[PDB]
Amino acid sequence: ESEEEARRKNWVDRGWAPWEEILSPEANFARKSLNEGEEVALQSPEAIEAFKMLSPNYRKKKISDMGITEDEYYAKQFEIKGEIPEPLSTMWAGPLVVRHVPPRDWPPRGWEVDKKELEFIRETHKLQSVRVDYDKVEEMVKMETDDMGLDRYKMFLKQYNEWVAANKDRLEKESYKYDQDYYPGRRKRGKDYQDGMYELPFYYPGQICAGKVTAIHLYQGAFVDIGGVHDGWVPIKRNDWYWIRHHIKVGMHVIVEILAKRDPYRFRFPIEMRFIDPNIDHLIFNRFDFAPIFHRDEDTNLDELRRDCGRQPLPRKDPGVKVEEEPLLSNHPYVDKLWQIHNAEQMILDDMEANPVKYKGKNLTELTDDEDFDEENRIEYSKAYYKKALLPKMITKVSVKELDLEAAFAERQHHNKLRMEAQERGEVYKIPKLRRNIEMDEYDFIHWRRSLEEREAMLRDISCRRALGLPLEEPGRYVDPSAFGKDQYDPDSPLYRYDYWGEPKNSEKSKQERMTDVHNKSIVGKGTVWYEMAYEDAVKERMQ
């Protein structure tokens, strides 16, 4: 492409800027001497001048030839070249008519005040909706003072004075504890803190304030002192400071407008403002999308940080399944916990029936099996179990403190007495179900009903949201279907896996042999299977 087009592209995307690049004499001579050639006589005038300027006496004579002081040359070294913009002018739109209104968020979280005073203070928010005609303002000007009504505002001030005297030491201690080094935007502490500075609650978005510029950062922006404990920040990015630096200088008195107030703990710059008097809205092209935050050590969950700051959610992989086109859930968490204690009770009852000597002499109502049971050591896992194969194992220390053996004893003593007489009658007795199984089935049923109600509500929720134009899924989470990428894909077609080349369908490892071996050993014969059906089908055929 063309040079102009290329420079345009760079300015737009990369951020190129032709800075001054103040050089030494030895270097200036190097930059203005290598353009001709090597060991060749210097014919250019600037090259000869740079060669002569390598001597200190030559420079101290040339500075006196033009009549400049010793500091004048050093000041002229750091001079901005190129075209300088015209001095900006301040064109005020019209009369500025304002009114002191207390902040809407004045009482901080955790500070209780009298209700009637807060009511009389908040009463002023209703009066802000009235309109004022700006043109006729001059006509109604009254120079006589002592007639203005500011009781509400005064009341706010009264409350404020109390709150600062109450919480100044606490705020300073928190600033010293959480913030280590001072930076433009943090709380003024130590020698920089003078009594009488407006604290952070005083301010509120929408207030015009006058201040002076005290800091200028290339990447962050300008910092204006508004006479408060926290400085103000005007977002100006890196590339705009090529033209904005001619209009904004350190120590300039400026008029700003507060547009947002944030928490100083999470956000680096609590007060962000815009310029009113030096209006430079035509030179800002790069802007911040989200306000800067602190990634501290206390916050360990990124979701809490995202919800506190207000940014988008962490993106995840896009699932191909639909929330409506999927089966329900019919597995209750208490199923395992009840099944294990039920099996434990059955086994203990069987062991007591087998050896009545141990069961005799002790009351069946209360049986102290083990007095060393610990809730912390209830979960014990040992992978040394290799009776049949090398595999891990777990041990569960069931407590007899909550085992309901009262009804279980009666149930077993009623069931065995009937099964024995059924066996004596020439019949085989198969117990259909027990009470614990009925309770587990009831738990499964209520959980299934909960899931059914959830999906019945979801079927109506999807409809209405679709109708009224509302997001069905949380925006910002499933936005990338496969933008996250380059993962090895098992699938051959992605080329992340092999495909036949010259008929190379051969597969490394993936031995089906090991599997074949366990199948072959038990049932080597390659006979044709006759009966083939699922276990549920087998139960259905058995019950039929």
Partner 1 sequence: LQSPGIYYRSELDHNGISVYTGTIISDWGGRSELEIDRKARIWARVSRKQKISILVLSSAMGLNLREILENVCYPEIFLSFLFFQQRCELGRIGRRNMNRRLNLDIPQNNTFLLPRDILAAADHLIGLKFGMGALDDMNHLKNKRIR
Partner 2 sequence: MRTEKPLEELYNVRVERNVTKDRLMELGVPRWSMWKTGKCKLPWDWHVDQLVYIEEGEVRVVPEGSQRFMQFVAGDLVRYPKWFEADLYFNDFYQERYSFRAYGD
Partner 3 sequence: VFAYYGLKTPPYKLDALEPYMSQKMLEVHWGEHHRSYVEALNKQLEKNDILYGCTMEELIKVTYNNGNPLPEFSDAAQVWNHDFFWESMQPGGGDMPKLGLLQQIEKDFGSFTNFREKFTEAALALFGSGWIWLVLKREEKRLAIVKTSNAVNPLVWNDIPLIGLDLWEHAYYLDYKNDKAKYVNVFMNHLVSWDAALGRMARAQAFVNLGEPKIPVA
Residue type, 115: K
Antiparallel, parallel or unpaired: β 271-275 and 253-261: antiparallel
Contacting partner 1 (CB under 8 A), which of 496, 516, 520, 537? 496
Residue 54, CA distances (Å) to 26, 51, 58, 166, 232 in order: 7, 6, 8, 66, 46
Token pair of 274 as six digits: 């815009």
Rounded to 5°, the CA angle 353-356-358 comes to 115
Antiparallel, parallel or unpaired: β 221-225 and 232-235: antiparallel
**Is 497 in contact with 491 (CB distance < 8 Å)?**
yes
Contacting partner 2 (CB under 8 A), which of 20, 36, 350, 456? 456
Position 72 contacts partner 1 (CB under 8 A): no
Residue 274 CB burial class (10 angstroms; 0-12, 13-18, ≥19): middle
- Considering only the stretches 150-158, 268-276, 369-377, 487-495, report the one whose residues sit in contact with partner 1 under the rule CB under 8 A: 487-495
- Among residues 169, 20, 153, the alpha carbon closest in space to that of 81 is found at 20
Token pair of 88 as six digits: 């900006």
**Is 160 in contact with 173 (CB distance < 8 Å)?**
no
Position 303 contacts partner 2 (CB under 8 A): yes
Q: How far is the CB of 393 from partner 2 (least distance, A)?
A: 22
| Residue nearer to partner 2 on the CB measure, 259 or 458 | 458
| Residue nearer to partner 3 on the CB measure, 476 or 494 | 476
| Residue nearer to partner 3 on the CB measure, 25 or 201 | 201
- Considering only the stretches 40-48, 100-108, 355-363, 496-504, report the one whose residues sit in contact with partner 3 under the rule CB under 8 A: 100-108
Position 504 contacts partner 1 (CB under 8 A): yes
Contacting partner 1 (CB under 8 A), which of 26, 353, 492, 517? 492
Considering just the CA atoms, what is the radius of gyration of the chain in Å?
41
| Residue nearer to partner 3 on the CB measure, 75 or 132 | 132
Residue 245 CA to residue 224 CA, distance in Å, equals: 15
Contacting partner 3 (CB under 8 A), which of 37, 227, 315, 475? 475
- Considering only the stretches 393-401, 439-447, 485-493, 504-512, report the one whose residues sit in contact with partner 2 under the rule CB under 8 A: 439-447
Position 110 contacts partner 1 (CB under 8 A): no
| Residue nearer to partner 1 on the CB measure, 45 or 504 | 504
Residue type, 300: T
Contacting partner 2 (CB under 8 A), which of 351, 370, 453, 499? 453
Position 468 contacts partner 3 (CB under 8 A): yes
Residues whose CB falls within 8 Å of the CB of residue 345, separated by 6 or more in sequence, listed in order: 403, 404, 405, 408, 436
Residue 502, binding choice from partner 2, partner 1, partner 3, none, Cβ under 5 to 8 Å by partner class? partner 1
Residue 453, binding choice from partner 2, partner 1, partner 3, none, Cβ under 5 to 8 Å by partner class? partner 2
Residue 375 CA to residue 396 CA, distance in Å, equals: 11
Contacting partner 2 (CB under 8 A), which of 14, 81, 109, 430? 109
Contacts 24+ apart (CB under 8 A), 1-7: none
How many residues of this chain bind partner 1 (CB under 8 A)?
19
Contacting partner 1 (CB under 8 A), which of 404, 406, 499, 517? 499
CA 63 to chain centroid = 59
How many residues of this chain bind partner 3 (CB under 8 A)?
40
Token pair of 357 as six digits: 């000597």
| Residue nearer to partner 2 on the CB measure, 409 or 443 | 443
Position 180 contacts partner 2 (CB under 8 A): no
Please count the CA atoms within 13 angstroms of the CA of 509 that sit on its side-chain side. 0
Strand partners, 433: none
**Is 380 in contact with 397 (CB distance < 8 Å)?**
yes
Position 129 contacts partner 3 (CB under 8 A): yes
Residue 187 CA to residue 176 CA, distance in Å, equals: 9
Helix H or strand E segment including 167: helix 151-178
Position 449 contacts partner 2 (CB under 8 A): yes
Q: Where on the chain is the footprint of partner 3 (CB under 8 A)?
A: 7-8, 11-12, 17-18, 82-83, 103-107, 109, 119, 122, 125-131, 205-206, 242-243, 274, 281-282, 284-285, 287, 468-471, 474-476
Q: Where on the chain is the footprint of partner 1 (CB under 8 A)?
A: 486-488, 492-504, 506, 508-509
Q: Where on the chain is the footprint of partner 2 (CB under 8 A)?
A: 109-110, 174, 178, 265, 298, 300-304, 307-308, 323, 332-334, 337, 443, 446-447, 449-450, 453-458, 460-461, 464-465, 468, 470, 473-474
